[PDB]
Amino acid sequence: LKKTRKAARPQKLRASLVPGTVLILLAGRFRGKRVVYLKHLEDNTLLISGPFKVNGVPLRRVNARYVIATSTKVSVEGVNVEKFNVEYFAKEEIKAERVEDQKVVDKALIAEIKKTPLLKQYLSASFSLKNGDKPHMLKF
Amino acid sequence: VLKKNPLKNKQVLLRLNPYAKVFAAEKLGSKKA
Amino acid sequence: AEQVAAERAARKAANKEKRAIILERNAAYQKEYETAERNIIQAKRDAKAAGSYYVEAQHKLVFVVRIKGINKIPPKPRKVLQLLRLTRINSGTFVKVTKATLELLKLIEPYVAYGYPSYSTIRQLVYKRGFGKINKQRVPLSDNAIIEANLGKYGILSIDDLIHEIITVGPHFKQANNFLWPFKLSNPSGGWGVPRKFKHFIQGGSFGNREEFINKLVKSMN
Amino acid sequence: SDNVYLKLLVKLYTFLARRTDAPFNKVVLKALFLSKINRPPVSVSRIARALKQEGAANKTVVVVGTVTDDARIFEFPKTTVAALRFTAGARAKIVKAGGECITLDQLAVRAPKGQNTLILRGPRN
RNA sequence: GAAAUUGUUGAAAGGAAGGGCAUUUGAUCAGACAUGGUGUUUUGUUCUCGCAU
RNA sequence: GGAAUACUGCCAGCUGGGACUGAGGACUGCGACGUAAGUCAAGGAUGCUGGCAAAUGGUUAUAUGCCGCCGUCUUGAAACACGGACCAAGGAGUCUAACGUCUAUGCGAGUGUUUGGGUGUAAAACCCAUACGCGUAAUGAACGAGGUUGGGGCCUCGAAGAGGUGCACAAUCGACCGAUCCUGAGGAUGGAUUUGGUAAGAGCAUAGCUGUUGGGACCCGAAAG
RNA sequence: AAGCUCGUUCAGUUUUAUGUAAGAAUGAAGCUUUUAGUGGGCCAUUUUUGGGC
RNA sequence: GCCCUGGGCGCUCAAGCGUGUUACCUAUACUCUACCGUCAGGGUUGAUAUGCCCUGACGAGUAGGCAGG
């Protein structure tokens, strides 16, 4: 095999994705649910939180291309997401750490969510389309 | 084995015409009178 | 052995010297083009200010593109196109402007479109579709050494030198044009525009002399 | 052709043509492909008469065709002849005169660039 | 022990079909034959020198 | 007095969305980055991840979107024109005599053993004396078995080129002879009007496609002595 | 197809000479020799014939 | 200028007519690339061969000719 000259350039994320932004998932068991972006992982996935205590969505890895960006942002500076890593999702039934870490993460974000009025209930409600909707026109 | 297209792929564009670097570094394409 | 590094260093030094030579030549050509355009504009300004009409020089370079298919072509235009290397449709080459050639275009005018190109269009064509003829083979122009080896004796050692020779119609115009393989051009990106292509350009058609519009047409067909 | 020896000679001459620059190899290689009619016999008389050419006292003659003995000549100066086939009479005449008859391979090994070589063709009209 | 032709059974559809381009439905099948590839200790003519592993 | 803007053309200006393509196969090459190690979008794709014991997909039937009976015939490409109920087997430029071109083999101015003889492991295989099929000194073949101009190539000198050299023959004129037109020591003998070759042979045998006439002659058929 | 040998010689290509010495442009060879087949009309056009053809 | 006497459905400030301005529909045509073959050029053996290759161009067709199975 010849020496292919293709360097692993780091991923470039679209400007519409910023930490603390409200994300919407279009695929998966949580499709249609509203989630909060936290950190970008080395595997090109997005670390997000429901938070779990609000809508039941735990910390999960998601792909940007399947996520619709929104202008609504919330503070995420107080959450120490450095603990999470790609190795934190390997498996080779819920693990004990998955509960305590999720609770700790949600404790530092439930207050911020409650700071903005109607944001808790807004996240608790699953997003869905309606008759006559025109996503291209809508800003989301 | 593969025909690199100039204009695009600036790396190959620099192979031919070394003055392209000076042209891009001096904005000669929009030079004022 | 010591050859592996010595030969590499020697060839790298020679290539660096040739690169500097080509750089200075390209800078000189660009300065000459800018000075010529500025002088032409200044002459036009002086003519306008002095209340006298301008005497623009005759167009010394033209480009012709085949517009009609081989079918039903009368023998004389077909022979003219064959001797002009305009065999397949949507193909063209640069030709010197003379009565010997203007009268030739007059015959093939119904089946071809032509005009006066420009520096930008010529450079784009030479860089993209520029193909050289070596040992009767078609070799794309991708390295200055390839052009230098075939036209080194004529003082051409880079793609910029070839473009300068083609645009200026210098003494080596014959060799520069012959070395260039006939240009393969696609159909216009935006279309021919006119609903009927087979008509004179001056009456809403396509074929015929269009002067500067040929530059626009080529870029869409490039 | 189908002769294995002819194929080997053709291979050798093709190798020499593109690696020795001298046209002598190319001419012999082209003449090798000539058919039997295109390679008429070359009599020893034709070699003897041409051997009096100025500056040919020590030159070597190569005959791609077939060397045939002749009864119209008697005196044969000492010389060297190379050809694909040598007749018994011609071979004896050449050897008797103190000369040497050799194959094309020996000529190529002694004159890689065709030095001192002379090519004589046979009549066709 | 073959074709035209004909008899039992199973799939089919509505003055006609066998033919050509791409797909689904029903049936049916090669289905990858992966048998592969990585480094040690246990016992007998100290032991992986090599056999069951 | 002032800019602005519509329009034209340039940007070896920037920044995206979407479609196909991954073709080459350990490094040798042209380039950019860098003070150097080294890196690069720089003579063709790499890195990660998920689903799987039927996986992907193939033949076939049926329904959907579009398209649509054969060989010979006059020859203006043509409708018209013969043949076809279906199936298994058979079926047609095959063999030969005399004359060649083309390709290969042996020998070579020689070539050809096989009408026969010797011999034999017995129509097999191996050898040859007479002559004999064809040319080899003919249209006595030398003024010299040709100079004048060229010429695949050979080298002297010098890369480009210069000199000579000359292979088959490219063109011309001459030499010998069958021969053309005078001459008359019977046609001698000396020239010469033109003539058909020699120059310093180039051929014989076998094998393969192939050309044309004759034998039935690519196959079935044609009013009869 | 068949040998040679010139790499250059050629053109259904385009204007001044008066049809060309063209050191005008553009494109990119020759003699042979024998070897299968080849005996049509027509659409349009040209020369522009007369009274429909 | 148009009207009167002299493809189907339908169309009537056309979905008729002439013309001007943009967009779109798609041929085996054109432009980029994957593969087979022919044709042309070249590398090749102090062994890597009627072979292993690199580069370009070309691909209609009856009788007929040649080549390969």
User: What CATH number does residue D119 fall under?
Assistant: 3.100.10.10
Cβ pair B3:C128 closer than 8 A? no
CA of C196 to C1' of H4 (A): 35
Q: Which of C81, C91, C96 is nearest to C138 (CA)?
A: C91
Q: Residue C26: which nucleotide is closest by CA–C1'?
A: F12
Residue among B5, B6, B19 minimizing CB distance to C30: B19
Cis amide bond preceding C117, omega within 30: no
Chain F nucleotides reached by a protein CB under 7 Å:
8-14, 17, 22-27, 29-33, 39-49, 102-110, 137, 145, 152-155, 164-170, 200-203
Q: Which subunits count as partners of chain C given 3+ CB pairs below 8 Å?
A: B
Cβ pair B23:C143 closer than 8 A? no
User: Given the structure tokens 């390679």, which residue do they identify?
Assistant: D39
C38 touches chain B (CB under 8 A): yes
> Residue C147, class by beta-carbon neighbours within 10 Å (0-12 exposed, 13-18 middle, 19+ buried)?
buried
Q: Sign of torsion, CA C112 C113 C117 C122? A: negative
The DSSP secondary-structure symbol of A73 reads: B
Cα separation, A3 vs A65, in Å, equals 31
Cα separation, C143 vs B15, in Å, equals 7
Cα separation, C203 vs C115, in Å, equals 16
Name every chain B residue with its beta carbon within 8 A of the beta carbon of C140: 3
The DSSP secondary-structure symbol of C202 reads: G
Q: What are phi and psi of C121, to 5 degrees?
A: -65, -40
Cα separation, C93 vs C84, in Å, equals 8
Buried b (16+ CB within 10 A) or exposed e, D23-40: ebbbbbbebbeeeeeebe
User: How many domains in chain D?
Assistant: 1
What part of C 39-68 touches B (C-beta under 8 Å)? none
Q: Which subunits count as partners of chain B given 3+ CB pairs below 8 Å?
A: C
Chain H nucleotides reached by a protein CB under 7 Å:
20-24, 29-33, 40-45, 49-50, 55-58
**Could you tell me how many CB contacts below 8 A there are between chain B and chain C?**
42
Minimum Cα–Cα distance from C125: chain B residue: B6
> Residue D90, class by beta-carbon neighbours within 10 Å (0-12 exposed, 13-18 middle, 19+ buried)?
buried
Name every chain C residue with its beta carbon within 8 A of the beta carbon of B2: none
Distances (CA, A) of D18 to C149, D23, D26, D105: 22, 10, 8, 17
Are D80 and D97 in contact, with CB atoms under 8 Å apart? Answer: no
Q: Do chains D and A touch (3 or more CB pairs under 8 A)?
A: no
Residue among C20, C128, C160 minimizing CB distance to B17: C160
Strand ordering across the sheet containing C61-66: C183-184, C91-96, C61-66, C112-115, C208-209
B31 touches chain C (CB under 8 A): yes
Cα end-to-end span (Å), chain B: 44
Are C21 and C157 in contact, with CB atoms under 8 Å apart? Answer: yes
Cβ pair C158:B33 closer than 8 A? no
Are C67 and C111 in contact, with CB atoms under 8 Å apart? Answer: yes
Q: Which residues contact C127 (CB under 8 A, 6 or more apart)?
A: B6, B7, B13, B16, C159
What part of C 152-181 touches B (C-beta under 8 Å)? 158-160
Q: Is the CB of C11 under 7 A from strand F?
A: yes
Cβ pair C30:B28 closer than 8 A? yes
Q: Do chains C and B touch (3 or more CB pairs under 8 A)?
A: yes
Are B12 and B5 in contact, with CB atoms under 8 Å apart? Answer: yes
Cβ pair B23:C142 closer than 8 A? no
